[PDB]
Write a protein that binds this ligand. Structure first.
Ligand SMILES: [Cl-]
Ligand SMILES: [Cl-]
Ligand SMILES: [Cl-]
Ligand SMILES: [Cl-]
Ligand SMILES: [Cl-]
Ligand SMILES: [Cl-]
Lengths: 310, 311
Protein backbone atom coordinates (compact mmCIF):
# COMPACT_ATOMS: atom_id res chain seq x y z
CA UNK A 1 0.00 0.00 0.00
CA UNK A 2 1.44 3.32 1.18
CA UNK A 3 5.24 3.60 0.87
CA UNK A 4 6.74 4.57 4.23
CA UNK A 5 10.29 4.69 2.89
CA UNK A 6 13.26 3.64 4.99
CA UNK A 7 15.10 4.84 8.07
CA UNK A 8 18.21 4.54 10.15
CA UNK A 9 18.56 5.58 13.82
CA UNK A 10 19.11 9.20 12.83
CA UNK A 11 17.05 10.04 9.75
CA UNK A 12 14.08 8.78 7.77
CA UNK A 13 14.11 8.82 3.95
CA UNK A 14 10.84 10.76 3.95
CA UNK A 15 9.79 13.96 5.67
CA UNK A 16 7.12 12.89 8.16
CA UNK A 17 4.01 14.75 9.23
CA UNK A 18 1.42 13.31 11.59
CA UNK A 19 -2.12 14.66 11.69
CA UNK A 20 -4.26 13.74 14.72
CA UNK A 21 -8.03 13.99 14.84
CA UNK A 22 -11.32 12.69 13.52
CA UNK A 23 -11.88 11.48 9.98
CA UNK A 24 -15.60 11.61 9.21
CA UNK A 25 -17.60 9.49 6.81
CA UNK A 26 -19.43 11.85 4.52
CA UNK A 27 -22.46 11.48 2.29
CA UNK A 28 -22.54 14.26 -0.30
CA UNK A 29 -24.96 14.90 -3.15
CA UNK A 30 -24.39 12.79 -6.24
CA UNK A 31 -25.88 13.32 -9.72
CA UNK A 32 -28.68 10.80 -10.02
CA UNK A 33 -31.55 12.35 -8.03
CA UNK A 34 -32.00 11.35 -4.39
CA UNK A 35 -28.54 9.76 -4.29
CA UNK A 36 -25.36 10.48 -2.34
CA UNK A 37 -21.69 9.61 -2.73
CA UNK A 38 -19.80 8.20 0.24
CA UNK A 39 -16.41 9.77 0.85
CA UNK A 40 -14.31 10.81 3.82
CA UNK A 41 -13.53 14.21 5.28
CA UNK A 42 -13.14 15.91 8.64
CA UNK A 43 -10.87 18.88 9.32
CA UNK A 44 -7.54 17.27 10.22
CA UNK A 45 -8.05 14.49 7.68
CA UNK A 46 -8.73 17.09 5.00
CA UNK A 47 -5.42 18.72 5.87
CA UNK A 48 -3.67 15.34 5.61
CA UNK A 49 -5.28 14.73 2.22
CA UNK A 50 -4.05 18.07 0.83
CA UNK A 51 -0.58 17.42 2.26
CA UNK A 52 -0.37 14.03 0.57
CA UNK A 53 -1.12 15.69 -2.77
CA UNK A 54 1.35 18.55 -2.21
CA UNK A 55 4.22 16.27 -1.23
CA UNK A 56 3.45 12.73 -2.43
CA UNK A 57 7.08 11.77 -1.80
CA UNK A 58 6.65 12.43 1.92
CA UNK A 59 5.07 10.38 4.67
CA UNK A 60 1.73 11.81 5.76
CA UNK A 61 0.38 9.85 8.73
CA UNK A 62 -3.07 10.03 10.34
CA UNK A 63 -3.67 9.00 13.95
CA UNK A 64 -7.22 8.40 15.14
CA UNK A 65 -9.54 5.59 16.20
CA UNK A 66 -12.12 3.81 14.04
CA UNK A 67 -14.49 0.87 14.47
CA UNK A 68 -14.24 -2.69 13.17
CA UNK A 69 -17.27 -2.60 10.88
CA UNK A 70 -17.39 -2.39 7.07
CA UNK A 71 -17.61 1.40 6.99
CA UNK A 72 -14.51 1.72 9.18
CA UNK A 73 -12.66 -0.60 6.83
CA UNK A 74 -13.72 1.54 3.88
CA UNK A 75 -12.36 4.56 5.73
CA UNK A 76 -9.03 2.81 6.27
CA UNK A 77 -8.88 1.83 2.59
CA UNK A 78 -9.66 5.38 1.49
CA UNK A 79 -6.79 6.73 3.56
CA UNK A 80 -4.40 4.30 1.91
CA UNK A 81 -5.74 5.11 -1.56
CA UNK A 82 -5.14 8.80 -0.85
CA UNK A 83 -1.50 8.12 0.04
CA UNK A 84 -2.10 8.61 3.76
CA UNK A 85 -0.38 6.33 6.30
CA UNK A 86 -3.08 4.91 8.57
CA UNK A 87 -0.85 2.25 10.12
CA UNK A 88 -1.34 3.72 13.57
CA UNK A 89 -5.15 3.80 13.57
CA UNK A 90 -6.68 2.26 16.66
CA UNK A 91 -9.69 -0.04 16.44
CA UNK A 92 -12.51 0.28 18.97
CA UNK A 93 -14.81 -2.76 18.76
CA UNK A 94 -18.50 -1.96 19.22
CA UNK A 95 -18.22 1.56 17.82
CA UNK A 96 -18.37 3.05 14.34
CA UNK A 97 -17.13 6.29 12.78
CA UNK A 98 -18.79 9.71 12.72
CA UNK A 99 -20.87 10.87 9.76
CA UNK A 100 -21.71 14.07 7.84
CA UNK A 101 -24.65 14.28 5.45
CA UNK A 102 -24.70 17.19 3.01
CA UNK A 103 -27.98 18.10 1.33
CA UNK A 104 -28.34 20.24 -1.75
CA UNK A 105 -31.63 21.97 -2.49
CA UNK A 106 -32.00 24.61 -5.21
CA UNK A 107 -28.24 25.11 -5.19
CA UNK A 108 -27.96 25.66 -1.43
CA UNK A 109 -25.92 23.32 0.79
CA UNK A 110 -26.57 22.47 4.42
CA UNK A 111 -25.24 19.66 6.61
CA UNK A 112 -26.17 17.36 9.48
CA UNK A 113 -23.79 15.34 11.60
CA UNK A 114 -23.74 12.32 13.89
CA UNK A 115 -20.56 11.93 15.92
CA UNK A 116 -21.36 11.89 19.63
CA UNK A 117 -20.43 8.22 20.00
CA UNK A 118 -17.78 7.83 17.29
CA UNK A 119 -14.71 5.68 17.83
CA UNK A 120 -12.52 8.75 17.28
CA UNK A 121 -13.55 10.14 20.66
CA UNK A 122 -11.37 7.36 22.13
CA UNK A 123 -8.21 8.37 20.20
CA UNK A 124 -6.46 9.44 23.43
CA UNK A 125 -7.32 6.25 25.31
CA UNK A 126 -3.84 4.74 24.78
CA UNK A 127 -1.05 7.17 25.76
CA UNK A 128 1.75 4.91 24.53
CA UNK A 129 0.16 4.66 21.07
CA UNK A 130 -0.04 8.45 20.83
CA UNK A 131 3.60 8.81 21.83
CA UNK A 132 4.72 6.19 19.32
CA UNK A 133 2.90 7.92 16.48
CA UNK A 134 4.59 11.23 17.27
CA UNK A 135 8.09 9.92 18.03
CA UNK A 136 9.72 10.46 14.63
CA UNK A 137 7.34 12.99 13.10
CA UNK A 138 8.88 16.22 11.86
CA UNK A 139 5.57 17.99 12.40
CA UNK A 140 2.59 16.98 14.55
CA UNK A 141 -0.68 18.69 13.61
CA UNK A 142 -3.95 18.77 15.54
CA UNK A 143 -7.03 20.97 15.84
CA UNK A 144 -9.63 22.30 18.24
CA UNK A 145 -11.92 19.57 16.93
CA UNK A 146 -9.31 17.01 18.00
CA UNK A 147 -9.60 18.54 21.49
CA UNK A 148 -13.39 18.94 21.46
CA UNK A 149 -14.16 15.28 20.78
CA UNK A 150 -12.14 14.08 23.80
CA UNK A 151 -13.22 14.01 27.45
CA UNK A 152 -11.09 15.89 29.98
CA UNK A 153 -8.84 12.89 30.65
CA UNK A 154 -8.30 12.37 26.93
CA UNK A 155 -7.60 16.08 26.46
CA UNK A 156 -4.97 15.91 29.19
CA UNK A 157 -3.43 12.74 27.73
CA UNK A 158 -3.15 14.31 24.28
CA UNK A 159 -1.72 17.59 25.62
CA UNK A 160 0.87 15.72 27.68
CA UNK A 161 1.93 13.68 24.64
CA UNK A 162 2.25 16.82 22.51
CA UNK A 163 4.32 18.61 25.17
CA UNK A 164 6.63 15.63 25.44
CA UNK A 165 7.05 15.34 21.67
CA UNK A 166 7.66 19.09 21.48
CA UNK A 167 10.47 18.78 24.02
CA UNK A 168 12.24 16.14 21.88
CA UNK A 169 12.22 18.42 18.86
CA UNK A 170 8.90 17.63 17.17
CA UNK A 171 7.40 20.77 15.65
CA UNK A 172 3.83 21.11 16.95
CA UNK A 173 1.21 22.86 14.76
CA UNK A 174 -2.31 23.72 15.92
CA UNK A 175 -5.50 24.80 14.10
CA UNK A 176 -7.75 26.15 16.88
CA UNK A 177 -10.81 25.63 14.62
CA UNK A 178 -13.49 26.70 17.11
CA UNK A 179 -16.80 24.88 16.59
CA UNK A 180 -19.04 25.84 19.52
CA UNK A 181 -21.58 23.07 18.88
CA UNK A 182 -18.97 20.39 19.66
CA UNK A 183 -18.34 21.71 23.19
CA UNK A 184 -20.54 21.28 26.26
CA UNK A 185 -19.60 24.70 27.59
CA UNK A 186 -18.12 28.04 26.49
CA UNK A 187 -15.47 28.41 29.17
CA UNK A 188 -14.33 24.83 28.65
CA UNK A 189 -14.02 25.56 24.93
CA UNK A 190 -11.94 28.70 25.20
CA UNK A 191 -9.78 27.36 28.04
CA UNK A 192 -9.09 24.07 26.27
CA UNK A 193 -8.21 25.79 23.01
CA UNK A 194 -5.64 27.85 24.89
CA UNK A 195 -4.28 24.67 26.53
CA UNK A 196 -3.72 23.49 22.96
CA UNK A 197 -1.97 26.76 22.20
CA UNK A 198 0.37 26.24 25.15
CA UNK A 199 1.90 23.09 23.61
CA UNK A 200 2.15 24.40 20.04
CA UNK A 201 4.96 26.07 18.08
CA UNK A 202 2.75 27.18 15.19
CA UNK A 203 -0.87 28.26 15.56
CA UNK A 204 -3.32 28.98 12.75
CA UNK A 205 -6.29 30.81 14.26
CA UNK A 206 -9.08 32.47 12.32
CA UNK A 207 -9.94 36.00 13.44
CA UNK A 208 -13.61 35.83 12.40
CA UNK A 209 -14.16 32.53 14.20
CA UNK A 210 -12.43 33.49 17.45
CA UNK A 211 -12.80 37.23 18.06
CA UNK A 212 -16.16 37.01 19.84
CA UNK A 213 -15.09 34.24 22.22
CA UNK A 214 -11.80 35.84 23.29
CA UNK A 215 -12.49 39.54 22.79
CA UNK A 216 -9.77 40.09 20.18
CA UNK A 217 -10.06 43.67 18.89
CA UNK A 218 -8.33 42.72 15.63
CA UNK A 219 -6.05 40.10 14.04
CA UNK A 220 -2.97 41.52 15.82
CA UNK A 221 -4.77 40.96 19.15
CA UNK A 222 -5.44 37.38 18.07
CA UNK A 223 -1.74 36.94 17.32
CA UNK A 224 -0.73 38.42 20.69
CA UNK A 225 -3.05 35.99 22.48
CA UNK A 226 -1.31 32.97 20.97
CA UNK A 227 2.19 34.38 21.46
CA UNK A 228 1.45 34.75 25.17
CA UNK A 229 0.84 30.98 25.30
CA UNK A 230 4.34 30.43 23.88
CA UNK A 231 3.42 30.03 20.21
CA UNK A 232 6.46 30.98 18.13
CA UNK A 233 4.72 31.48 14.79
CA UNK A 234 1.12 32.73 14.76
CA UNK A 235 -0.60 32.98 11.36
CA UNK A 236 -4.01 34.64 11.60
CA UNK A 237 -6.50 33.82 8.85
CA UNK A 238 -9.12 36.54 8.32
CA UNK A 239 -11.23 35.59 5.32
CA UNK A 240 -10.40 37.66 2.23
CA UNK A 241 -8.36 40.14 4.28
CA UNK A 242 -4.59 40.23 4.65
CA UNK A 243 -3.10 37.45 6.76
CA UNK A 244 -1.44 38.89 9.87
CA UNK A 245 1.42 36.98 11.42
CA UNK A 246 3.56 37.27 14.52
CA UNK A 247 6.83 35.44 14.88
CA UNK A 248 9.21 35.98 17.78
CA UNK A 249 8.11 39.56 18.37
CA UNK A 250 7.98 40.45 14.67
CA UNK A 251 4.73 41.25 12.85
CA UNK A 252 3.90 41.26 9.16
CA UNK A 253 1.00 41.03 6.73
CA UNK A 254 0.51 38.96 3.60
CA UNK A 255 -2.17 40.14 1.17
CA UNK A 256 -4.75 37.65 -0.06
CA UNK A 257 -5.64 38.03 -3.74
CA UNK A 258 -9.40 38.29 -4.35
CA UNK A 259 -11.13 35.05 -5.28
CA UNK A 260 -13.74 35.23 -8.01
CA UNK A 261 -16.35 32.54 -8.62
CA UNK A 262 -16.83 31.25 -5.09
CA UNK A 263 -18.29 27.72 -5.21
CA UNK A 264 -17.78 26.16 -1.78
CA UNK A 265 -15.70 27.43 1.12
CA UNK A 266 -15.65 24.00 2.78
CA UNK A 267 -12.12 23.06 3.88
CA UNK A 268 -10.65 26.44 2.83
CA UNK A 269 -8.99 26.67 6.24
CA UNK A 270 -7.88 23.02 6.21
CA UNK A 271 -6.24 23.46 2.82
CA UNK A 272 -4.64 26.78 3.85
CA UNK A 273 -3.08 24.88 6.75
CA UNK A 274 -1.79 22.15 4.44
CA UNK A 275 -0.26 24.69 2.08
CA UNK A 276 1.42 26.48 4.96
CA UNK A 277 2.82 23.30 6.54
CA UNK A 278 3.98 21.91 3.19
CA UNK A 279 5.97 25.10 2.60
CA UNK A 280 7.31 25.20 6.18
CA UNK A 281 8.58 21.61 5.87
CA UNK A 282 10.28 22.57 2.64
CA UNK A 283 12.24 25.16 4.61
CA UNK A 284 10.62 28.20 3.01
CA UNK A 285 10.35 31.51 4.90
CA UNK A 286 7.07 32.07 6.79
CA UNK A 287 5.92 34.82 4.41
CA UNK A 288 6.43 32.52 1.41
CA UNK A 289 4.55 29.74 3.18
CA UNK A 290 1.65 32.07 3.94
CA UNK A 291 1.41 33.13 0.29
CA UNK A 292 1.38 29.48 -0.80
CA UNK A 293 -1.31 28.71 1.79
CA UNK A 294 -3.54 31.51 0.53
CA UNK A 295 -3.07 30.41 -3.07
CA UNK A 296 -4.19 26.85 -2.34
CA UNK A 297 -7.13 27.98 -0.21
CA UNK A 298 -8.36 30.22 -3.02
CA UNK A 299 -8.46 27.28 -5.41
CA UNK A 300 -10.35 25.22 -2.84
CA UNK A 301 -12.91 28.04 -2.46
CA UNK A 302 -13.34 27.88 -6.25
CA UNK A 303 -13.97 24.12 -6.05
CA UNK A 304 -16.74 21.89 -4.71
CA UNK A 305 -16.40 19.74 -1.61
CA UNK A 306 -13.91 19.16 1.19
CA UNK A 307 -11.34 17.48 -1.06
CA UNK A 308 -10.68 19.59 -4.15
CA UNK A 309 -8.29 18.35 -6.80
CA UNK A 310 -6.12 21.41 -7.32
CA UNK B 1 -51.89 16.69 2.06
CA UNK B 2 -53.11 13.42 3.56
CA UNK B 3 -56.92 13.17 3.74
CA UNK B 4 -57.95 12.83 7.39
CA UNK B 5 -61.66 12.52 6.66
CA UNK B 6 -64.34 13.91 8.95
CA UNK B 7 -65.65 13.20 12.44
CA UNK B 8 -68.47 13.84 14.86
CA UNK B 9 -68.32 13.32 18.64
CA UNK B 10 -68.92 9.59 18.33
CA UNK B 11 -67.31 8.28 15.15
CA UNK B 12 -64.70 9.22 12.57
CA UNK B 13 -65.26 8.62 8.85
CA UNK B 14 -61.96 6.70 8.69
CA UNK B 15 -60.74 3.77 10.75
CA UNK B 16 -57.73 5.16 12.62
CA UNK B 17 -54.45 3.40 13.42
CA UNK B 18 -51.65 5.21 15.26
CA UNK B 19 -48.07 3.92 15.09
CA UNK B 20 -45.58 5.32 17.62
CA UNK B 21 -41.84 5.07 17.27
CA UNK B 22 -38.78 6.17 15.35
CA UNK B 23 -38.61 6.71 11.60
CA UNK B 24 -35.02 6.50 10.36
CA UNK B 25 -33.29 8.07 7.41
CA UNK B 26 -31.85 5.19 5.40
CA UNK B 27 -29.21 5.02 2.69
CA UNK B 28 -28.77 1.92 0.56
CA UNK B 29 -26.50 1.11 -2.41
CA UNK B 30 -27.59 2.68 -5.68
CA UNK B 31 -26.61 1.98 -9.27
CA UNK B 32 -23.18 3.66 -9.45
CA UNK B 33 -20.33 2.40 -7.21
CA UNK B 34 -19.89 4.42 -4.03
CA UNK B 35 -23.36 5.96 -4.28
CA UNK B 36 -26.41 5.50 -2.06
CA UNK B 37 -30.12 6.25 -2.38
CA UNK B 38 -31.83 8.10 0.48
CA UNK B 39 -35.19 6.88 1.76
CA UNK B 40 -36.98 6.45 5.08
CA UNK B 41 -37.64 3.39 7.17
CA UNK B 42 -37.51 2.24 10.79
CA UNK B 43 -39.64 -0.61 12.16
CA UNK B 44 -42.84 1.12 13.26
CA UNK B 45 -42.74 3.46 10.26
CA UNK B 46 -42.38 0.49 7.91
CA UNK B 47 -45.49 -0.99 9.48
CA UNK B 48 -47.35 2.30 8.93
CA UNK B 49 -46.15 2.40 5.31
CA UNK B 50 -47.54 -1.08 4.60
CA UNK B 51 -50.79 -0.24 6.40
CA UNK B 52 -51.30 2.89 4.30
CA UNK B 53 -51.07 0.76 1.15
CA UNK B 54 -53.35 -1.98 2.52
CA UNK B 55 -56.08 0.47 3.53
CA UNK B 56 -55.50 3.77 1.68
CA UNK B 57 -59.04 4.85 2.60
CA UNK B 58 -58.17 4.70 6.34
CA UNK B 59 -56.18 7.12 8.50
CA UNK B 60 -52.72 5.84 9.35
CA UNK B 61 -51.06 8.25 11.77
CA UNK B 62 -47.44 8.29 12.88
CA UNK B 63 -46.39 9.86 16.16
CA UNK B 64 -42.74 10.69 16.78
CA UNK B 65 -40.38 13.64 17.00
CA UNK B 66 -38.11 15.00 14.26
CA UNK B 67 -35.73 17.97 13.99
CA UNK B 68 -36.08 21.21 12.03
CA UNK B 69 -33.37 20.65 9.43
CA UNK B 70 -33.53 19.66 5.76
CA UNK B 71 -33.40 15.92 6.42
CA UNK B 72 -36.26 16.21 8.93
CA UNK B 73 -38.29 18.12 6.37
CA UNK B 74 -37.63 15.46 3.75
CA UNK B 75 -38.77 12.82 6.26
CA UNK B 76 -42.00 14.69 6.94
CA UNK B 77 -42.56 15.05 3.19
CA UNK B 78 -41.92 11.32 2.60
CA UNK B 79 -44.52 10.41 5.23
CA UNK B 80 -47.12 12.60 3.53
CA UNK B 81 -46.22 11.16 0.12
CA UNK B 82 -46.74 7.66 1.53
CA UNK B 83 -50.27 8.51 2.71
CA UNK B 84 -49.24 8.63 6.37
CA UNK B 85 -50.67 11.33 8.64
CA UNK B 86 -47.74 13.08 10.30
CA UNK B 87 -49.84 15.91 11.71
CA UNK B 88 -48.88 15.01 15.26
CA UNK B 89 -45.12 14.93 14.72
CA UNK B 90 -43.20 16.97 17.29
CA UNK B 91 -40.35 19.22 16.18
CA UNK B 92 -37.24 19.44 18.35
CA UNK B 93 -35.10 22.46 17.34
CA UNK B 94 -31.36 21.85 17.01
CA UNK B 95 -31.73 18.10 16.69
CA UNK B 96 -31.85 15.86 13.64
CA UNK B 97 -33.21 12.40 12.92
CA UNK B 98 -31.54 8.99 13.21
CA UNK B 99 -29.87 7.44 10.20
CA UNK B 100 -28.68 4.08 9.02
CA UNK B 101 -26.34 3.21 6.19
CA UNK B 102 -26.26 -0.10 4.35
CA UNK B 103 -22.91 -0.95 2.76
CA UNK B 104 -21.67 -4.03 0.92
CA UNK B 105 -18.68 -6.18 1.85
CA UNK B 106 -17.92 -9.00 -0.58
CA UNK B 107 -21.53 -8.73 -1.72
CA UNK B 108 -23.01 -8.92 1.78
CA UNK B 109 -25.06 -6.16 3.43
CA UNK B 110 -23.54 -4.42 6.46
CA UNK B 111 -25.46 -1.89 8.60
CA UNK B 112 -24.18 1.14 10.49
CA UNK B 113 -26.49 3.38 12.46
CA UNK B 114 -26.43 6.70 14.24
CA UNK B 115 -29.37 7.38 16.53
CA UNK B 116 -28.01 8.08 20.01
CA UNK B 117 -29.06 11.74 19.86
CA UNK B 118 -32.04 11.60 17.49
CA UNK B 119 -35.09 13.82 18.02
CA UNK B 120 -37.28 10.72 18.23
CA UNK B 121 -35.83 9.93 21.65
CA UNK B 122 -37.91 12.89 22.87
CA UNK B 123 -41.20 11.49 21.55
CA UNK B 124 -42.60 10.99 25.06
CA UNK B 125 -41.51 14.38 26.40
CA UNK B 126 -45.02 15.84 26.15
CA UNK B 127 -47.61 13.63 27.86
CA UNK B 128 -50.57 15.64 26.56
CA UNK B 129 -49.45 15.41 22.93
CA UNK B 130 -49.10 11.63 23.33
CA UNK B 131 -52.56 11.29 24.87
CA UNK B 132 -54.10 13.46 22.15
CA UNK B 133 -52.61 11.35 19.36
CA UNK B 134 -54.07 8.21 20.96
CA UNK B 135 -57.48 9.64 21.91
CA UNK B 136 -59.49 8.53 18.88
CA UNK B 137 -57.20 5.82 17.49
CA UNK B 138 -58.89 2.47 16.96
CA UNK B 139 -55.52 0.79 17.36
CA UNK B 140 -52.31 2.15 18.90
CA UNK B 141 -49.19 0.26 17.81
CA UNK B 142 -45.67 0.48 19.24
CA UNK B 143 -42.52 -1.61 19.46
CA UNK B 144 -39.61 -2.59 21.68
CA UNK B 145 -37.54 -0.12 19.69
CA UNK B 146 -40.07 2.55 20.67
CA UNK B 147 -39.33 1.65 24.30
CA UNK B 148 -35.56 1.24 23.89
CA UNK B 149 -34.87 4.76 22.64
CA UNK B 150 -36.66 6.50 25.51
CA UNK B 151 -35.25 7.38 28.92
CA UNK B 152 -36.89 6.16 32.14
CA UNK B 153 -39.29 9.12 32.37
CA UNK B 154 -40.21 8.77 28.70
CA UNK B 155 -40.85 5.05 29.08
CA UNK B 156 -43.02 5.70 32.12
CA UNK B 157 -44.96 8.43 30.31
CA UNK B 158 -45.57 6.23 27.26
CA UNK B 159 -46.61 3.16 29.25
CA UNK B 160 -48.92 5.35 31.32
CA UNK B 161 -50.54 6.82 28.20
CA UNK B 162 -50.90 3.36 26.62
CA UNK B 163 -52.57 1.93 29.74
CA UNK B 164 -54.98 4.88 29.94
CA UNK B 165 -55.86 4.58 26.25
CA UNK B 166 -56.40 0.84 26.68
CA UNK B 167 -58.80 1.56 29.54
CA UNK B 168 -60.97 3.82 27.37
CA UNK B 169 -61.33 1.15 24.70
CA UNK B 170 -58.38 1.73 22.39
CA UNK B 171 -56.82 -1.52 21.21
CA UNK B 172 -53.11 -1.69 22.01
CA UNK B 173 -50.75 -3.68 19.79
CA UNK B 174 -47.08 -4.36 20.58
CA UNK B 175 -44.18 -5.76 18.58
CA UNK B 176 -41.43 -6.59 21.08
CA UNK B 177 -38.72 -6.37 18.36
CA UNK B 178 -35.66 -7.11 20.53
CA UNK B 179 -32.54 -5.13 19.57
CA UNK B 180 -29.97 -5.72 22.34
CA UNK B 181 -27.53 -3.00 21.17
CA UNK B 182 -30.19 -0.33 21.78
CA UNK B 183 -30.42 -1.26 25.47
CA UNK B 184 -28.09 -0.30 28.34
CA UNK B 185 -28.33 -3.83 29.71
CA UNK B 186 -30.09 -7.13 29.07
CA UNK B 187 -31.88 -6.84 32.40
CA UNK B 188 -33.37 -3.47 31.48
CA UNK B 189 -34.26 -4.93 28.06
CA UNK B 190 -36.22 -8.01 29.15
CA UNK B 191 -37.95 -6.23 32.03
CA UNK B 192 -38.93 -3.23 29.92
CA UNK B 193 -40.21 -5.42 27.08
CA UNK B 194 -42.50 -7.21 29.53
CA UNK B 195 -43.67 -3.85 30.86
CA UNK B 196 -44.66 -3.15 27.26
CA UNK B 197 -46.53 -6.45 27.18
CA UNK B 198 -48.45 -5.51 30.33
CA UNK B 199 -50.28 -2.63 28.58
CA UNK B 200 -50.92 -4.48 25.32
CA UNK B 201 -53.95 -6.39 24.07
CA UNK B 202 -52.10 -7.84 21.07
CA UNK B 203 -48.43 -8.93 21.05
CA UNK B 204 -46.47 -9.96 17.96
CA UNK B 205 -43.22 -11.54 19.18
CA UNK B 206 -40.75 -13.33 16.94
CA UNK B 207 -39.52 -16.65 18.31
CA UNK B 208 -36.29 -16.37 16.36
CA UNK B 209 -35.48 -12.96 17.84
CA UNK B 210 -36.60 -13.63 21.41
CA UNK B 211 -36.10 -17.29 22.31
CA UNK B 212 -32.53 -17.18 23.60
CA UNK B 213 -33.07 -13.93 25.55
CA UNK B 214 -36.13 -15.15 27.45
CA UNK B 215 -35.28 -18.86 27.51
CA UNK B 216 -38.36 -19.84 25.49
CA UNK B 217 -38.30 -23.59 24.75
CA UNK B 218 -40.56 -23.10 21.72
CA UNK B 219 -43.14 -20.73 20.20
CA UNK B 220 -45.84 -21.95 22.61
CA UNK B 221 -43.59 -20.89 25.51
CA UNK B 222 -43.19 -17.51 23.86
CA UNK B 223 -46.97 -17.19 23.68
CA UNK B 224 -47.42 -18.26 27.32
CA UNK B 225 -44.95 -15.57 28.38
CA UNK B 226 -47.06 -12.79 26.83
CA UNK B 227 -50.35 -14.25 28.06
CA UNK B 228 -49.04 -14.16 31.64
CA UNK B 229 -48.58 -10.40 31.23
CA UNK B 230 -52.24 -10.06 30.25
CA UNK B 231 -51.92 -10.05 26.45
CA UNK B 232 -55.23 -11.30 25.05
CA UNK B 233 -53.96 -12.21 21.59
CA UNK B 234 -50.40 -13.43 21.11
CA UNK B 235 -49.23 -14.18 17.57
CA UNK B 236 -45.74 -15.75 17.38
CA UNK B 237 -43.75 -15.27 14.19
CA UNK B 238 -41.16 -17.93 13.51
CA UNK B 239 -39.54 -17.34 10.13
CA UNK B 240 -40.76 -19.87 7.54
CA UNK B 241 -42.30 -22.08 10.24
CA UNK B 242 -45.95 -22.24 11.34
CA UNK B 243 -47.29 -19.23 13.22
CA UNK B 244 -48.39 -20.27 16.71
CA UNK B 245 -51.02 -18.20 18.47
CA UNK B 246 -52.70 -18.04 21.86
CA UNK B 247 -55.91 -16.15 22.52
CA UNK B 248 -57.81 -16.24 25.83
CA UNK B 249 -56.41 -19.66 26.68
CA UNK B 250 -56.91 -21.20 23.22
CA UNK B 251 -53.92 -22.21 21.06
CA UNK B 252 -53.64 -22.65 17.32
CA UNK B 253 -51.24 -22.84 14.39
CA UNK B 254 -51.38 -21.21 10.96
CA UNK B 255 -49.25 -22.63 8.12
CA UNK B 256 -46.82 -20.35 6.30
CA UNK B 257 -46.66 -21.32 2.61
CA UNK B 258 -43.10 -21.61 1.21
CA UNK B 259 -41.54 -18.60 -0.49
CA UNK B 260 -40.45 -19.08 -4.13
CA UNK B 261 -37.21 -17.10 -3.88
CA UNK B 262 -36.03 -15.28 -0.74
CA UNK B 263 -34.55 -11.96 -1.87
CA UNK B 264 -34.47 -9.77 1.24
CA UNK B 265 -36.11 -10.35 4.63
CA UNK B 266 -35.87 -6.69 5.66
CA UNK B 267 -39.15 -5.58 7.23
CA UNK B 268 -40.75 -9.02 6.83
CA UNK B 269 -41.85 -8.78 10.46
CA UNK B 270 -42.99 -5.16 10.09
CA UNK B 271 -45.11 -6.10 7.08
CA UNK B 272 -46.52 -9.19 8.80
CA UNK B 273 -47.67 -6.86 11.58
CA UNK B 274 -49.25 -4.48 9.10
CA UNK B 275 -51.09 -7.35 7.38
CA UNK B 276 -52.31 -8.68 10.72
CA UNK B 277 -53.53 -5.30 12.04
CA UNK B 278 -55.21 -4.45 8.72
CA UNK B 279 -57.25 -7.65 8.88
CA UNK B 280 -58.03 -7.29 12.61
CA UNK B 281 -59.24 -3.73 11.99
CA UNK B 282 -61.51 -5.15 9.27
CA UNK B 283 -63.11 -7.40 11.88
CA UNK B 284 -61.71 -10.68 10.54
CA UNK B 285 -61.12 -13.66 12.86
CA UNK B 286 -57.58 -14.00 14.22
CA UNK B 287 -56.71 -17.06 12.10
CA UNK B 288 -57.81 -15.18 8.98
CA UNK B 289 -55.70 -12.17 9.99
CA UNK B 290 -52.69 -14.40 10.54
CA UNK B 291 -52.99 -15.98 7.07
CA UNK B 292 -53.17 -12.48 5.55
CA UNK B 293 -50.16 -11.36 7.59
CA UNK B 294 -48.12 -14.36 6.44
CA UNK B 295 -49.17 -13.77 2.82
CA UNK B 296 -47.96 -10.15 2.80
CA UNK B 297 -44.74 -11.02 4.65
CA UNK B 298 -44.05 -13.68 2.04
CA UNK B 299 -44.24 -11.08 -0.72
CA UNK B 300 -41.98 -8.68 1.17
CA UNK B 301 -39.39 -11.47 1.60
CA UNK B 302 -39.49 -11.89 -2.18
CA UNK B 303 -38.87 -8.19 -2.67
CA UNK B 304 -35.91 -5.86 -2.27
CA UNK B 305 -35.74 -3.14 0.40
CA UNK B 306 -37.65 -2.25 3.55
CA UNK B 307 -40.59 -0.88 1.61
CA UNK B 308 -41.79 -3.38 -1.00
CA UNK B 309 -44.58 -2.25 -3.32
CA UNK B 310 -47.05 -5.10 -3.11
CA UNK B 311 -50.41 -4.80 -4.86
CL1 LIG C 1 19.77 1.24 10.46
CL1 LIG D 1 -20.27 24.70 15.50
CL1 LIG E 1 -16.64 20.27 26.65
CL1 LIG F 1 10.71 32.49 8.69
CL1 LIG G 1 -35.70 -1.08 11.97
CL1 LIG H 1 -29.15 -5.05 18.31
Amino acid sequence: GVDLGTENLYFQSMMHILSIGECMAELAPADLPGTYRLGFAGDTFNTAWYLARLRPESRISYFSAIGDDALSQQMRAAMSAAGIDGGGLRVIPGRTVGLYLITLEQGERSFAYWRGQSAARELAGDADALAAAMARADVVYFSGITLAILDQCGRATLLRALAQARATGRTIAFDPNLRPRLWAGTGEMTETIMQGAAVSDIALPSFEDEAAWFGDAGPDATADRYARAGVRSVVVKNGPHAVHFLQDGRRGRVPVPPVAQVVDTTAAGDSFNAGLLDSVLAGQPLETAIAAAAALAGQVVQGKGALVEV
